Amino acid sequence: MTTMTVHTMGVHYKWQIPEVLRQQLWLAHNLREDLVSLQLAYDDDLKAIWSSDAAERRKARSDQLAADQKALYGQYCRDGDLYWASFNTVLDHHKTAVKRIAAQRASGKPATLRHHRFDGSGTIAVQLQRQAGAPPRTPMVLADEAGKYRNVLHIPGWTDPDVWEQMTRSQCRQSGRVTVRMRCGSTDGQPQWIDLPVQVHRWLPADADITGAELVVTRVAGIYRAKLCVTARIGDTEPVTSGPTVALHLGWRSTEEGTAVATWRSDAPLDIPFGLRTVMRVDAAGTSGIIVVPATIERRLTRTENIASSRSLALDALRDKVVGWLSDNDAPTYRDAPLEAATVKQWKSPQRFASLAHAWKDNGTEISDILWAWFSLDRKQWAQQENGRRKALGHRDDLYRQIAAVISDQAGHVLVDDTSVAELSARAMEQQKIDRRRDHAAPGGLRASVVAAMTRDGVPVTIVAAADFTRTHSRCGHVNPADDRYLSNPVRCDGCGAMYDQDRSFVTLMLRAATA
RNA sequence: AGCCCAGCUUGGCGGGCGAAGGCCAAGACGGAGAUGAGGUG
DNA sequence: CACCTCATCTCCCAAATAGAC
DNA sequence: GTCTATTTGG
Ligand SMILES: [Mg+2]
Ligand SMILES: [Zn+2]
């Protein structure tokens, strides 16, 4: 029954962030910073105590940290504008973070908390309390205007998924445009709600249970984006029992048709969508194939890098012009202080010059126009420099997920390697350009998406020990030495004595080992 | 040529260059947080 | 000191209390 | 007296 899921809805791009939401984000950021400082003080005090059996001392110091955490609830929630759901969310995140840090230190790997700086991105939360002996928080309950959670979270127009899938995409997209009234904390003791105009693509099972929701705001290229994520407790799915066995193995051999990333071998024929056959290649028999990634991903990422370099060039030229003009002319006051050539010359970030241009948008001086001459163009190309990158990465991710789906649609047993990921990606990945491909390939992402699909769809997953498999030749079964002979493919064997493919032999070994 | 125009990816139609304006088709979809690395200024 | 990539691991609460009607 | 929003210890 316990299968948590998250459904996300995208707020309309024509929704300026209201002041209430901005203040909630600011308060959450301040709370996290204060918790970080308190934890750092606690860590230093524990170090000092150890620098002096002391468990009572440690226990006493820990309790004082607990009191300050409670006193933060008094400062931010009891006498502030923060919502008690946001505070609980941030406190839980901080507690989990410090627990993970302690676990890491126990092994011997050092770690520490790092401050951050507010930029406008953040998170607000809402928790749907369900006491014992209460009806479930089904989507029909949240869609009701006079329901229990009408002032906490209201998601109108829920249409049954069985009926939802029958509607055409036009009807599904036009009817999915709804408004969600979300509780947004307090304001001088005056509770505030926000009407998010959202677009919904999928709905929830009628038997779900909405545990909570959260609104996430992120700044991409200077433009705010908001997304509402709703968490529900879907009932579990019966695990599959019948289906072909598929073994998946990672690779990174460069190919003329893109970056080849994976090799899969199935014990029975698999059917692949015709929209993936250029990505998920399949041999004649349908039992083995290669997953390659297109070349457009690489071209787009290279174009983004070129854009970043051109931006650097333009910024350096503008810096030189600004320093020259400032030296040759007077300095109008900015930030209540005269402008100095030294400060401008040492500037690196485009943000400083963008802010200066905004301040001097209409100073009337010549350089102001020059400054605007840059600030316009920079704000365009910057968008490109990031947006295309995201799109490119998005494309790759989509492909991976699609591929994962097809496996869970047919496979009855999926096998994955274990030690052929980290160490192999560290050593045989083939340096700055060499390591660039692996970031663009990101085979670990494909592995993770496949694993997630198999877990969600009930497919059993078996992890095969890749130890002493790379050097193994399937046709002969002899361990060839590690003489970097595998820098290419195929590689001559030291057993039978013939060039054998390093990927097909590996996956056939995997299939043999699983069914033994 | 890019990026943007009711979630995301891919396409088609019609538009915008910081402002506009959306319409359709196919597919997939578990998010947040922190830490650790790799790099880049 | 600031930015980006990628890799791992957690987690997803509800009982008690006081109020507006 | 009944749903409801807030505080708080796991
Ligand atoms: Mg869009
Ligand atoms: Zn051999």
- Beta strand A193-199 with A3-11: parallel, antiparallel or unpaired? antiparallel
Residue of A297, A292, A287, A263 lying closest to A277 (CA atoms)? A292
For the beta carbon of residue A474, count every other beta carbon within 10 angstroms: 19
Residue A464, beta-bridge partner list: A417
Residue A123 CA neighbour count, 13 Å, CB half: 15
Confirm if A125 and A89 have CB atoms less than 8 A apart. Answer: yes
> What would the two tokens of residue A204 be?
């929830």
Measured CA distances, A416 to A32, A145, A234, A286, A413 (Å): 39, 48, 27, 19, 10
What is the b/e burial string over A119-139, where b = at least 16 CB atoms within 10 angstroms of the residue's CB? eeebbbbbbbeeeeeeeebbb
Give residue numbers after which chain A breaks (C–N above 2.5 Å).
52, 430
Tell the burial category of A438 from Cβ atoms under 10 Å away from its Cβ (0-12, 13-18, 19+).
middle
In Å, what is the separation between the CA of A123 and the C1' of B17? 31
Residue of A190, A184, A188 lying closest to A80 (CA atoms)? A188
Residues 6+ apart with CB under 8 A from A266: A244, A245, A246, A247, A286, A287, A288, A411
Residue A224, beta-bridge partner list: A219
Residue A58 φ/ψ, nearest 5 degrees: -65, -40
Helix A366-410 crosses helix A296-328 at what angle (to 10 degrees)? 160
Task: Protein contacts on strand C: list nucleotides below 7 Å from a Cβ.
Answer: 2-16
**Rounded CA separation A223/A220 (Å):** 5
SS3 label, residue A384 = helix
Task: Protein contacts on strand D: list nucleotides below 7 Å from a Cβ.
Answer: 3-10
In Å, what is the separation between the CA of A383 and the C1' of B14? 23
Residue of A400, A415, A405 lying closest to A244 (CA atoms)? A415
Residue A484, beta-bridge partner list: none
- Both ends of chain A: CA-CA distance in Å? 33
* H/E stretch holding A35: helix A19-50
**Rounded CA separation A258/A115 (Å):** 40
Lookup: nucleotide whose C1' is closest to A183 CA: D5
DSSP per-residue letters across A102-128:
HHHHHHT-----------S-EEEEEE-
C-beta within 7 A of nucleic chain C, residues 294-313 of A:
none
Four-way CATH pick for A245-294+392-514: 3.40.50, 3.30.420, 1.10.10, 1.10.150? 3.30.420
C-beta within 7 A of nucleic chain B, residues 250-279 of A:
273, 275
Looking at chain A, the number of H-run helices and the number of E-run strands are: 14, 15
Residues 6+ apart with CB under 8 A from A501: A489, A490
Residues 6+ apart with CB under 8 A from A289: A263, A264, A280, A281, A282, A283
For chain A, which residues make up each domain, given as ranges? 3-15+124-234, 19-107, 245-294+392-514, 298-388
SS3 label, residue A457 = coil
Instruction: Give the residue ranges with Cβ < 7 A from strand D.
Output: A 70, 73-74, 77-78, 84, 87-88, 91-92, 95, 129, 146, 148-152, 183, 186, 191
Confirm if A90 and A32 have CB atoms less than 8 A apart. Answer: yes
**Rounded CA separation A445/A202 (Å):** 24
Residues 6+ apart with CB under 8 A from A250: A261, A262, A417, A420, A421, A424, A425, A443, A444, A446, A447
SS3 label, residue A8 = strand
**Rounded CA separation A477/A487 (Å):** 20
Residues with C-beta atoms within 5 A of ion ligand 2? A 473, 476, 493, 495-496
Confirm if A258 and A295 have CB atoms less than 8 A apart. Answer: yes
SS3 label, residue A9 = strand
Q: Which amino acid is at A250?
A: L
Tell the burial category of A218 from Cβ atoms under 10 Å away from its Cβ (0-12, 13-18, 19+).
middle
Residues 6+ apart with CB under 8 A from A3: A233, A234, A235, A236, A237, A456
Residue A204 CA neighbour count, 13 Å, CB half: 30
Confirm if A231 and A160 have CB atoms less than 8 A apart. Answer: no
SS3 label, residue A189 = coil
**Rounded CA separation A148/A129 (Å):** 10
For the beta carbon of residue A85, count every other beta carbon within 10 angstroms: 21
Tell the burial category of A53 from Cβ atoms under 10 Å away from its Cβ (0-12, 13-18, 19+).
exposed
Handedness of CA A335, A339, A344, A346 (dihedral sign): negative
Method: cryo-EM
Helix intervals (H) in A122-222: 139-143, 161-166, 169-175
Q: What angle do CA A279, A280, A283 make, to 5 degrees?
A: 125
**Rounded CA separation A69/A397 (Å):** 40
For the beta carbon of residue A514, count every other beta carbon within 10 angstroms: 16
**Rounded CA separation A269/A62 (Å):** 60
**Within 7 Å: CB of A387 and strand B?**
yes
Confirm if A260 and A252 have CB atoms less than 8 A apart. Answer: yes
Residue appearing with tokens 């002969």: A476
Handedness of CA A25, A30, A36, A42 (dihedral sign): negative
Measured CA distances, A490 to A259, A423, A427 (Å): 17, 21, 19
- Report the phi/psi class of residue A283: left, alpha or beta, with left for phi > 0 and alpha for psi in -120 to 50: beta
Lookup: nucleotide whose C1' is closest to A85 CA: D6
Q: 3-class secondary structure for A288-345?
A: EEEEEECCHHHHHHHHHHHHHHHHHHHHHHHHHHHHHHHHHCCCCCECCECCCHHHHH
Residue A349 φ/ψ, nearest 5 degrees: -65, 140
SS3 label, residue A454 = helix
Confirm if A302 and A295 have CB atoms less than 8 A apart. Answer: no
- Beta strand A258-266 with A254-255: parallel, antiparallel or unpaired? antiparallel
Lookup: nucleotide whose C1' is closest to A90 CA: B33
> What would the two tokens of residue A161 be?
């998924």
Handedness of CA A95, A98, A102, A108 (dihedral sign): positive
Residue A98 φ/ψ, nearest 5 degrees: -70, -30
* H/E stretch holding A258: strand A258-266
Residue of A125, A130, A133 lying closest to A142 (CA atoms)? A130
**Rounded CA separation A202/A196 (Å):** 17
Q: 3-class secondary structure for A326-342?
A: HHHCCCCCECCECCCHH
Q: Which amino acid is at A154?
A: H
Q: 3-class secondary structure for A66-96?
A: HHHHHHHHHHHHHCCCCCHHHHHHHHHHHHH
Task: Protein contacts on strand B: list nucleotides below 7 Å from a Cβ.
Answer: 2-11, 17-18, 20, 22-41
- A387-394 own/partner pairs: CB under 8 Å, 24+ apart: A387/A220, A387/A221, A388/A300, A388/A303, A388/A304, A389/A300, A389/A301, A389/A304, A390/A220, A391/A300, A392/A296, A392/A297, A392/A300, A392/A301, A392/A304
